[PDB]
Scaffold this active site. Structure first.
Site, mmCIF file in Angstrom:
data_model
loop_
_atom_site.group_PDB
_atom_site.id
_atom_site.type_symbol
_atom_site.label_atom_id
_atom_site.label_comp_id
_atom_site.label_asym_id
_atom_site.label_seq_id
_atom_site.Cartn_x
_atom_site.Cartn_y
_atom_site.Cartn_z
ATOM 1 C CG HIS A 191 -5.780 -1.985 -2.275
ATOM 2 N ND1 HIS A 191 -4.803 -2.662 -1.574
ATOM 3 C CD2 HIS A 191 -5.508 -0.665 -2.122
ATOM 4 C CE1 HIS A 191 -3.979 -1.789 -1.019
ATOM 5 N NE2 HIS A 191 -4.394 -0.570 -1.325
ATOM 6 C CD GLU A 192 -6.613 1.663 -4.918
ATOM 7 O OE1 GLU A 192 -6.593 2.510 -3.986
ATOM 8 O OE2 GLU A 192 -5.622 0.975 -5.222
ATOM 9 C CB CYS A 194 -0.931 0.028 1.221
ATOM 10 S SG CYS A 194 -2.165 1.386 1.226
ATOM 11 C CG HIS A 236 -7.160 2.973 0.443
ATOM 12 N ND1 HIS A 236 -6.469 2.981 1.634
ATOM 13 C CD2 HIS A 236 -6.313 2.452 -0.476
ATOM 14 C CE1 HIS A 236 -5.258 2.485 1.448
ATOM 15 N NE2 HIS A 236 -5.130 2.169 0.172
#
Ligand code: NB4
Ligand code: NI
Length: 191
Positions: A162-163, A119, A166
């Site tokens: 993954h994004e 990351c 966030h």
């Protein structure tokens, strides 16, 4: 604000714009954007994609001091908005700036990258399988407010999840099996 200075015409996102673990913004849930988008919100998406492209250029990455990236989320820039950029090369398997992305369907099957995840906001290695959905259906809006519904698998599916994590205040190591980081659970596909 971060958005005001990052969207100046002259600004080039670099690692100094990316916040790291310990910054509370990475653990907050980002706000949806409203439509129509402001010019700054469109420019931000463009700046984030430019960063990914610089990060994947050997020359620019070294000159600018960049870690390579295939995705980026606005909270990583201290901008608590639901905006992500994804740039997965094959030219590109997936190139998109997504506003208000949302998983609307997911497979029972799980998947994880065999090489684990890093990351840009995490300045340390955390080994292990980051367990995600193998396949996702994702709704998002583009800069024009047009809605898109796409189906992802393989690496593309991992990157978008993954994004999206966030923008929900979730970090990749939240999904590693703490008791055995490299356990291959039933129904887990290793990519
Ligand atoms: C797998 C990979 N992860 C890289 N880093 N991590 C990131 O992108 C983070 C996001 C990714 C972590 C796992 C899933 C999403 C950033 N993040 O924290 C976002 O939120 C890479 F950089 C990378 N690639 C492959 C393509 N290659 C083309 C040539 O240039 C080098 C480039 C390297 N593949
Ligand atoms: Ni990340």
């Amino acid at each position: 604000s971060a958005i005001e200075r990052i969207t100046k015409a002259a600004h080039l996102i670099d690692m100094n714009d990316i916040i790291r673990e310990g910054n509370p913004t990475l653990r907050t849930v980002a706000e949806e954007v409203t439509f129509p988008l402001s010019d700054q919100e469109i420019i931000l998406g463009e700046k984030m994609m430019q960063f990914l492209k610089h990060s994947q250029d050997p020359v620019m990455a070294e000159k600018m001091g960049l870690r390579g990236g295939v995705g980026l989320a606005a909270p990583q820039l201290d901008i608590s908005k639901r905006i992500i950029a994804v740039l997965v090369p094959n030219a590109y398997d997936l190139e998109a700036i997504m506003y208000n992305p949302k998983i609307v369907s997911h497979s029972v099957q799980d998947a994880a990258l065999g090489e684990g995840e890093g990351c840009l906001s995490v300045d340390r290695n955390v080994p292990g399988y980051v367990v995600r959905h193998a396949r996702v259906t994702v709704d998002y809006f583009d800069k024009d407010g047009e809605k898109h519904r796409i189906k992802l698998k393989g690496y593309n599916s991992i990157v978008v999840q993954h994004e999206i994590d966030h923008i929900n205040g979730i970090m990749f190591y939240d999904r590693i099996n703490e008791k055995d980081p490299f356990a291959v659970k039933d129904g887990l596909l290793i990519l």
